[PDB]
Design a protein around this ligand. Structure first.
Ligand SMILES: *CCC(=O)N1CCC([C@@H]2CCNc3c(C(N)=O)c(-c4ccc(Oc5ccccc5)cc4)nn32)CC1
Length: 267
């Protein structure tokens, strides 16, 4: 179908790194168009389910969401072909101190992500693992949301529940940690943590705690605190994502309006 790219149309040009599914490469499609190619190592993914979901993902389209161009599934490893983001993952970009970011730039990164998440929310599509490591940066410095929904297809159980040793505890609200209750409001919580990561220039959330200690901190009702670079108004926005009661957390539409208000007031 239209979700299938012919891998013969790819020219591989550069290694981009490795993650839990294996290697990612940069190349060209039909000699002209920049693409990234994520190669899914055998045994790592629930492949038939992912392939079916890729059809849904191809219909998503937003300027701040990494575009899925297609998949290559006639051979193994299968390929995911996407828009190319030359500046890599947001986490590592934030940690490069040479950039000497202004706080207006940091707030713009938050706004980029919030726009993508408002779009996903309008499509009833949960990210399920939003974090700076899962956002990408293009050659213009624009941040886009990536790997959306992908955690649903991971076969390594260390990633798939809080009983696992590689679960995103530090991005999880109390109802996820205690009950596995995912919702729009668990994406909201994670977005607040992501804002904290941005304003902390890529520090690990709860940097001095283990995952187990973090879950206890959350069970006691405690929270991250204000990054040095966040104004009081910015801190209010990120902190609003962490209400104990999920229903008291904002929507992405509300967060976007709040971010724009602050951008105007701090311009
Ligand atoms: C900090 C995290 C980290 O070290 N890595 C994750 C990003 C990896 C590289 C970096 C360079 N660019 C890039 C791209 C890209 N599109 O340019 C990708 C990538 C990410 C996701 C997908 O496939 C999907 C997209 C959207 C939804 C579902 C799947 C393809 C390609 N990865 N990188 C380096 C390591």
């Amino acid at each position: 179908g239209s979700w299938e790219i012919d891998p013969k149309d790819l020219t591989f040009l550069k290694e981009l790194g490795t993650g839990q599914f294996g290697v990612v490469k940069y190349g060209k499609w039909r000699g002209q168009y920049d693409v990234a190619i994520k190669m899914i190592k055998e045994g790592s993914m629930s492949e038939d389910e992912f392939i079916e979901e890729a059809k849904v993902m191809m219909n998503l389209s937003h300027e701040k969401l990494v575009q899925l161009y297609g998949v290559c599934t006639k051979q193994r490893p299968i390929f995911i072909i996407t828009e190319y983001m030359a500046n890599g993952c947001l986490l590592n970009y934030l940690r490069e101190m040479r950039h000497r970011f202004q706080t207006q730039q940091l707030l713009e990164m938050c706004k980029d992500v919030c726009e993508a998440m408002e779009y996903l929310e309008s499509k009833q599509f949960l990210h399920r693992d939003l974090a700076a490591r899962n956002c990408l940066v293009n050659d213009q410095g624009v941040v886009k949301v990536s790997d959306f929904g992908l955690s649903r297809y991971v076969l390594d159980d260390e990633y798939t529940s809080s009983v696992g040793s590689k679960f995103p505890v530090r991005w999880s609200p109390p109802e996820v940690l205690m009950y596995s209750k995912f919702s729009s409001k668990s994406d909201i919580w994670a977005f607040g943590v992501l804002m904290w990561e941005i304003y902390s220039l890529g520090k690990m959330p709860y940097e001095r705690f283990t995952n187990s200690e973090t879950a206890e901190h959350i069970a006691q009702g405690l929270r991250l605190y204000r990054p040095h670079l966040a104004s009081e108004k910015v801190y209010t926005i990120m902190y609003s994502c962490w209400h104990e009661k999920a229903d008291e957390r904002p929507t992405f539409k509300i967060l976007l309006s709040n971010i724009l208000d602050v951008m105007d007031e701090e311009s």
